[PDB]
Design a binder for this molecule. Structure first.
Ligand SMILES: Cn1c(=O)n(CCCO)c(=O)c2c1nc(Oc1ccc(/N=N/c3ccccc3)c(OC(F)(F)F)c1)n2Cc1ccc(Cl)cc1
Lengths: 645, 35
């Protein structure tokens, strides 16, 4: 291939040496070369090197100010040299250039936007002192509309710009991080950059809060605008990093608690034993001796837990044979009368919580829909019982009752209802330092299981269709007192769709025998086909499908368990803050700013000053701290030699 | 939005030369400054 240089040109025979002299830093040579004032021998001071660098821009690349000033005194064309100086972070070049078609910068980029991008405190302050404004973020050439919007959000989300041009940096970081998270859902092509921009805004608030020196400052930041008003505001904005901070966690634990392994469980049990004593004491007389003792959040939490374990006890005692035979339409027993106050209290709590939020963010969590289902089932149970009591009477053998009888449905719904009641108790694991992180990371990897169900159910339906279509013409019901696969002799596994759908579910656990594929005829070809499809379903679901469900759970457990302490602490503080107020200090069985601104801003000014100091004066080292030491030595040598002669 | 500085004062004009001299390493000029 006889190659050639396509679409280019040649610069000159003279200006090459001038560019070389500019590069080498020779002051005299480039001074005499430029002395062709108004009479030039066809040498352009605006020559462009083959890589696009210009003589003015070459001096910027070495941040050597003497030739910069010499060139500026001859009115060389700048165009965008200020942007280059800002991008390369040279204070002297920006100072000099601030008072005096091809561009490698996007046309909507302004010097302030790029300066905020570089996160250099000095240049941003220098530009702000002159007076600038970034367009507000608030469609024909959509490629540059999204790029322009992204650029101004990156400049807005910079710690340097926020620290010197915000009324309240603790508030402009909460809102801007919130809208950056929700803006990554409407622009899915740039979701990896919008969400990584919001994550850096959450770190800014935590770092700003890390600069507190005394507990006097910390309690004043979180109490701004009844108690812990700003701390609850951070929880609303999902600021996990800000909330899970050791200095504020210590204060929160001090409020919560207001000893060894065998010295704490025993006293917890001892306190929990007399649950109904300092609950009636509260109603009788709210005195400091007993009425105010339950006001401690730790004591209140224990009272609500022991009162719930008591409910689970006589719930287990209602299935005993000791406590109304097999009679039709019976009256409630003595256990159910004791059960009723707990159900009524739970329903009252759910009712008073229902209108407190208006079903927004109230039913969206998983720990409220289950409760709603539980109370709905309990209400259905009591309604069915009271309906059956007034329209049914007389002692009749239980075997003779027709199915769908109201009593049978009532007890079935009651049996279903109390399974959820006992499973709800797993939500208390988040208060223990050992089962807390394990349970939080347990329900977070569970969301990845829900996506394999969408393919498992499709495979199940696909195989059930074929099995039913093959076997639906061989069903029989003579000589069979019992019918189905839930029988001693399974006979009709694949006769109907409803039976085929559940005979394939029980085959995962190996509870379906191999003779259910036989028909009462000498048809060996169809039997073999049915057995082959059953075995193929067994192979796919148990050797392939379920083998790769665990193959990703450990590969997704790695990401979940990375930051598994922040999420657990957020859950624990959410649990804690629900016991800090008045209104819930009654277990369900027994329930049936002129100067404030002054102080806040004077503290915040010091906090911001410490943050910016630690960010600029303590980050030059993070190797680069000794690079300027050699420059200082060389400059001192040069000054001494020049001044001596 | 419109941005202005918030609680940051300007130092001086003459002292800039002194600070530049103490930063670069010119031992003569700094001695003239303290003189
Ligand atoms: C799905 N299934 C099945 O439902 N029943 C029940 C039928 C009625 O009860 C089987 O009995 C059976 C079976 N699978 C095999 O054994 C294999 C295993 C892997 C094979 N290939 N693997 C690969 C892997 C990668 C690439 C290519 C092939 C394979 O080859 C074949 F036939 F092509 F599947 C056969 N047997 C046992 C058997 C084997 C041979 C014979 Cl002559 C009779 C019974």
């Amino acid at each position: 291939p006889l190659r050639i240089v396509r679409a280019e040109s040649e610069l000159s025979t003279q200006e090459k040496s001038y560019l070389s002299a500019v590069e080498k830093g020779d002051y005299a040579s480039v001074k005499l070369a430029l002395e062709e004032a108004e009479i030039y021998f066809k040498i352009n001071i605006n020559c462009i090197d083959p890589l696009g660098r210009t003589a003015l821009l070459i001096a910027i690349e070495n941040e050597n100010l003497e030739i910069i000033e010499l060139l500026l005194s001859f009115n060389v064309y700048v165009g965008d040299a200020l942007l280059h100086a800002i991008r390369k972070e040279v204070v002297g070049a920006v100072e000099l250039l601030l008072n005096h078609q091809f561009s490698d910068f996007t046309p909507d980029i302004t010097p302030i936007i790029l300066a905020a991008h570089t996160n250099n405190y000095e240049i941003i302050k220098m530009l702000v002192q002159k007076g600038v404004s970034v367009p507000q973020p608030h469609d024909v050439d959509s490629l540059r509309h999204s790029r322009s919007r992204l650029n101004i959000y990156k400049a807005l989300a910079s710690p340097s710009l926020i620290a010197l041009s915000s009324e309240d940096p603790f508030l402009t970081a909460f809102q801007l991080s919130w809208e950056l998270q929700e803006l990554s859902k409407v622009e899915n092509e740039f979701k990896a950059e919008y969400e990584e921009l919001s994550h850096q805004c959450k770190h800014f608030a935590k770092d700003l809060l890390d600069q507190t020196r005394s507990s006097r400052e910390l309690e004043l930041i979180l109490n701004f605008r009844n108690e812990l008003a700003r701390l609850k505001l951070a929880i609303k904005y999902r600021q996990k990093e800000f909330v899970a901070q050791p200095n504020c966690q210590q204060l929160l634990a001090s409020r919560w608690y207001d000893r060894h392994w065998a010295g704490k469980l025993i006293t917890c049990v001892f306190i929990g034993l007399m649950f109904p004593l300092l609950s009636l004491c509260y109603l009788v007389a709210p005195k400091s001796r007993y009425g105010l003792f339950i006001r401690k959040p730790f004591i209140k939490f224990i009272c609500h837990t022991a009162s719930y374990l008591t409910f689970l006890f006589l719930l287990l005692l209602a299935s005993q044979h000791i406590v109304n035979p097999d009679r039709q339409g019976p009256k409630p027993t003595t256990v159910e009368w004791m059960i009723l106050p707990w159900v009524l209290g739970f329903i009252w709590t759910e009712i008073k919580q229902m209108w407190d939020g208006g079903f927004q963010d109230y039913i969206h969590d998983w720990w409220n829909l289950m409760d709603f289902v539980m109370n709905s089932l309990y209400l259905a149970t009591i309604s069915l019982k009271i309906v059956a009591y007034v329209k049914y009477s007389g002692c009749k053998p239980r075997d003779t009752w027709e199915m769908w009888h109201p009593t049978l449905v009532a007890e079935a719904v009651f049996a279903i209802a109390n399974i959820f009641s006992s499973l709800r108790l797993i939500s208390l694991f988040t208060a223990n330092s050992h089962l807390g992180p394990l349970q939080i990371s347990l329900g977070r990897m569970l969301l990845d299981i829900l996506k394999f169900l969408f393919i498992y159910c499709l495979v199940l339906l696909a195989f059930a269709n074929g099995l039913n279509q093959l076997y639906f013409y061989y069903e029989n019901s003579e000589g069979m007192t019992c019918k189905g696969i839930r029988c001693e002799r399974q006979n009709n596994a694949f006769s109907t769709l409803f039976e085929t759908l559940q005979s394939l579910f029980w085959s995962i656990f190996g509870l379906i025998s191999l003779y259910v594929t036989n028909v009462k005829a000498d048809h060996k070809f169809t039997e073999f086909v049915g057995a082959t499809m059953f075995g193929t379903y067994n192979v796919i679901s148990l050797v392939v499908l379920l083998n790769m469900l665990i193959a990703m759970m450990n590969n997704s457990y790695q990401h979940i368990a990375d930051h598994a302490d922040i999420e657990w602490k957020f859950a624990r503080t959410k649990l804690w803050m629900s016991y800090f107020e008045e209104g819930g200090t009654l277990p369900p069985p027994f329930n049936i700013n002129v100067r404030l601104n002054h102080q806040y801003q004077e503290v915040l000014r010091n906090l911001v000053k410490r943050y910016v100091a630690a960010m600029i004066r303590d980050a030059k080292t993070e190797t680069e701290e000794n690079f300027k030491e050699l420059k200082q030595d060389i400059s001192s040598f040069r000054y001494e030699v020049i001044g001596m002669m």
